[PDB]
Amino acid sequence: KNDMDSFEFYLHTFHDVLIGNNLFGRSALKTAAELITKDEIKTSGSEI
Amino acid sequence: QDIFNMIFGTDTGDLTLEEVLKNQELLYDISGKLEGISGDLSEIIAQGNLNTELAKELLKIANEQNNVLTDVNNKLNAINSMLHIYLPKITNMLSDVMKQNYALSLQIEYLSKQLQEISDKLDVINLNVLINCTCTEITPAYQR
Amino acid sequence: QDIFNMIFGTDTGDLTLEEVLKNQELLYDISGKLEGISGDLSEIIAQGNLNTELAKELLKIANEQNNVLTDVNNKLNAINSMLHIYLPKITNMLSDVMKQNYALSLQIEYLSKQLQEISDKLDVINLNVLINCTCTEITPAYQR
Amino acid sequence: SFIDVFNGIYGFATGIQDIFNMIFGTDTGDLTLEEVLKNQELLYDISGKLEGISGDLSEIIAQGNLNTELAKELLKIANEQNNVLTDVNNKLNAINSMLHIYLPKITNMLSDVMKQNYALSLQIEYLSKQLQEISDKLDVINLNVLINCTCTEITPAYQRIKYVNEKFDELTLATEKTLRAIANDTLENLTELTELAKSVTKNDMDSFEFYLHTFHDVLIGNNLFGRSALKTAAELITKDEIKTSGSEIGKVYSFLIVLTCLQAKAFLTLTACRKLLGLSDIDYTNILNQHLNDEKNVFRDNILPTLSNKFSNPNYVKTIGSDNYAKVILEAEPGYALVGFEIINDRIPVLKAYKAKLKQNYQVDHQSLSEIVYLDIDKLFCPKNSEQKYYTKSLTFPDGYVITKITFEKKLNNLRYEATANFYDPSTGDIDLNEKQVESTFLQADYISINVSDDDGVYMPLGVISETFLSPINSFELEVDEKSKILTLTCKSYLREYLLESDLINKETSLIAPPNVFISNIVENWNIEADNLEPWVANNKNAYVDSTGGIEGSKALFTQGDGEFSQFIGDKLKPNTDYIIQYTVKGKPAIYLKNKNTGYTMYEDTNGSSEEFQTIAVNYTSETDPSQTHLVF
Amino acid sequence: KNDMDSFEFYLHTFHDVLIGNNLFGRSALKTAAELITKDEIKTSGSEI
Amino acid sequence: VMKQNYALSLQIEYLSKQLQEISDKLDVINLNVLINCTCTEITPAYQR
């Protein structure tokens, strides 16, 4: 269904928030990366 | 992309999914009986040797009965088209789509476990600082 | 409550608002011509003195033409019901509803001005303290 | 033209109104496209059924004997039925012709709308870049309280509007490409665009118009429960320190422009989608103007007077300067004023000072915009192996004075600077030359001493020391901390007055973004992006223009063998004048300055190897009045 | 239309937020009343 | 279903009263930072 709450709209919003196309560019990818890279997490694998 | 091409391979030529009324069992016998009665009435009218007004009113009631039979036959034909030439194709497409989707998701199974482990490590040892490293604008879209 | 009673006073007996196809002008003449042709064919069939197979095939084509005419007449009847016995009643109800709504809203006109003045006074002289005196949970519902 | 003049919110609204008038000029008829399609399908079904019946009647009337009277009656009935069928087919063909003439007009209107929307959106690219820089430099780790107060109510409407605008642009571009690369295929191409138009023009709850109205409501703060998004966003931007180009006024104005142009593009998309479906034409000019005027009034009356017109340098670079005499004079000609500065440190530090005439109410004239380039600016602000004493003072002038000349003098590591400001008389925009004031530090006794301490170089200011748009300055100063060895160029702009008199009262606006390109360079087509290059000429096909073998996507000149690129620049080469030759190269190039007759290499590289692109900047002098000298690469 | 975003749902949500049927009883009426009753507002009529 | 649901909900009346008392006694004037972190994602689902 095509409307202001369509599934494709949510896909595009998810992509925009991930890449940082917000009002103040708060990219979700960078925030999640800086959350993961905390030294308190002790799991296998590097930060990359 | 390959699954997209497979999906586009399904014909579905000029057909749109509809609601199966699940009334085929009664509609079939109703259509058969109405067809028999309409045929008998048509033969009676076509035999001739009838009064003009009587023949005209018989023709009118035959037309109305044919309207009823045509509506029943149209409903039955829609049901048959849904259940015979549309649903099997859609079910085969869904089977192939889910098989290929499962095959692709088998690749992302170790990484899902790694993300789950990272999440289990985060919530055990954290504080309000984690609040500064959280995004709320993406939660509705992600959940959806 | 009085406006609710007035709204409930409208009959709308077993009628649901539909889409006016705006095709009455062509459908009327199409229905008239098809009715004339169907009547002539019915008279020809009812006159008798015809071959049995010829009479039967004429009856079949007359039934199909009557199906077409019946579909056209049903569409025209739906259009006429919308434009003659449903739309005028709904428009009268809407006129009465908006008149009484305007009469009631005339009462809340000084208070709206007072609220507007309060809002104009708030935004001119305020600071981040106003942030502590704002509600966000109600904004979507209020705006809607 | 190297100048990105911004026409203001009023200019953007006027452009949107022009596009609205262009849209309303296309007459689609009196029937909605959906109604046309419904009529077409109804007539098609009726025509098919009648064709079947007529075929059956014809095949049963031409087979039997049918007697004489019966044959005549059947022939008459068939004639009547065929007349009805021909009437239905004529109506269907009329519908098809109407559709076949309606679709090309719609496609042309969509193409024109896309072209004009792109032309209008080209203006706000600089403002989007500025907002992105502000967001990147924003200290969000401790400002999450405010950033979750502004983008908590505007976020849904903003997301909906951005999604609708981007999808409309993408679909229009796709349709244009398909048309460049009949009615049924056009409908099959435009089905997605028509679905988008139905979604955005659906007069229902939580529609596109609903979010468009709630965007303005949240920006203004009509409801008593919520807070104005503009005011809290301005508080977020202005508080703390955001070390970016422009002052608080410029940053908040850029944010307001971004939001306003987003709203204008949303209204344009709504109007275009309404016209695409063939719906009734309702002019959104009044409501769009009301929203923009309300937002500008809120910014003008509740935000702008509390903002500061003070702008500093964007960032700093740790460099070791030099010693001995170093004098720079940012003098402007009579009738001119300084509007901004730029310090660039890529190969050799340079100082670009922009000077221009004024056109009433502190308006910078783009016609007379010029720049002065000073080389080796690092040797003026920093020492090499001694201690430098700075005699700093806030050279603030009374309101109504515009700074014309700024002079820096470093003598025996004593950096003393003075400024001169002439009277402006904003009512007429005439910089009076007789009435002037001088604020000087040449006679100061107190100073601030900084020791270089070899590797501990001083942080020279770097970036664009200018307002978000070029504007005259009435206060200029250099700030020295003496703790971290940081020098800051701090100025005060006149943007507030020009905004109050030009854009915030709905008048003509002409704002000039600080150029990122040297506007005084004499090399026509300095970066090869313009097609059909007249100055650049190739001696043969050996050397060509690579569309992707340059900086980012620049069409760099690629030379392979004996081929070379020549450009005659002897007309603009002044005799006995110093010049800076700068170029980004890759591989092993060679740059010469030939003199046509009696070919001699005034300047020559003849070496330099690099597998990647690097920037080379050198000094050059032309002495014996060349009047004929072409660059050869 | 009856769904999770129906108009009647928004009416009920508006009423609940007004009377304070939230997770932590943040009544919108009381918040708006304490916002209006600030002495900085100089308009005709009492706080009542 | 209504009878048994009422019987079950009779148990949580005391807990609802306790939560209401906590909300009333909550110092929300300076705790708006946290109260806008918990009831910002759970609010739509809770309302529905």
Residue numbers in the entry:
A (entry chain D), E (entry chain B): 222 to 269
B (entry chain D), C (entry chain B): 30 to 173
D (entry chain A): 14 to 194, 202 to 653
F (entry chain C): 126 to 173
What's in the article?
Here we identified Vip3Cb1 and Vip3Cc1, the first Vip3 proteins with broad lepidopteran activity discovered outside of Bt from Paenibacillus strains in the P. popilliae-containing clade, most closely linked to P. dendritiformis. Vip3 proteins, including Vip3Cb1 and Vip3Cc1, are highly conserved in Domains (D) I and II involved in pore formation, with divergence in DIII, IV, and V known to be involved in receptor binding to the gut of the insect host. Vip3Cb1 protoxin and trypsin-processed Vip3Cb1 toxin structures were determined using Cryo-EM, resulting in density maps with an estimated resolution of 2.6 Å and 3.0 Å, respectively. Therefore, structural comparisons of Vip3Cb1 to other Vip3 proteins, including commercial Vip3Aa, are consistent with other results, such as amino acid homology, that all Vip3 proteins share the same mechanism of action, even though these originated from a Paenibacillus strain and not from Bt.
Each dimer pair (monomers A/B, or monomers C/D) is conformationally distinct, with equivalency between monomers A and C and monomers B and D. Domains I (DI) (residues 1–192) and II (residues 202–329) are α-helical, whereas DIII (residues 330–533), DIV (residues 534–675), and DV (residues 676–797) are composed of β-sheets, with homology to carbohydrate binding motifs connected by extended loops. DI of each monomer is composed of two twisted α-helices (α2 and N-terminal α3) connected by a five amino acid loop, allowing α2 to fold back to interact with α3. In the tetramer, DI folds into what could resemble the nose of a spaceship, with the monomers arranged in an A-B-D-C configuration. DII forms the spaceship main body (α1, C-terminal α3, α4-α9), containing a central helix (α8) surrounded by other helices, preceded by the tryptic site (Lysine195) for protoxin activation; however, this site had poor density for modeling (residues 195–202). DIII (β1-β14) forms the spaceship base, ending with a helix (α11) that interacts with DII. From DIII, a linker extends, interacting with N-terminal residues, before starting the extended fins of the spaceship, DIV (β15-β24) and DV (β15-β34). Comparisons of available Vip3 structures, determined by either X-ray protein crystallography, Vip3B2160 (45) or Cryo-EM Vip3Aa16 (43) and Vip3Bc1 (44), revealed that the Vip3Cb1 protoxin has an overall similar quaternary “spaceship” structure with α-helical DI-DIII forming the body and β-sheet DIV-V forming the fins. Activation of the Bt Vip3A protoxin occurs by cleavage between domains DI and DII. The Vip3Cb1 N-terminus has the signature Vip3A signal peptide “ALPSF” motif.
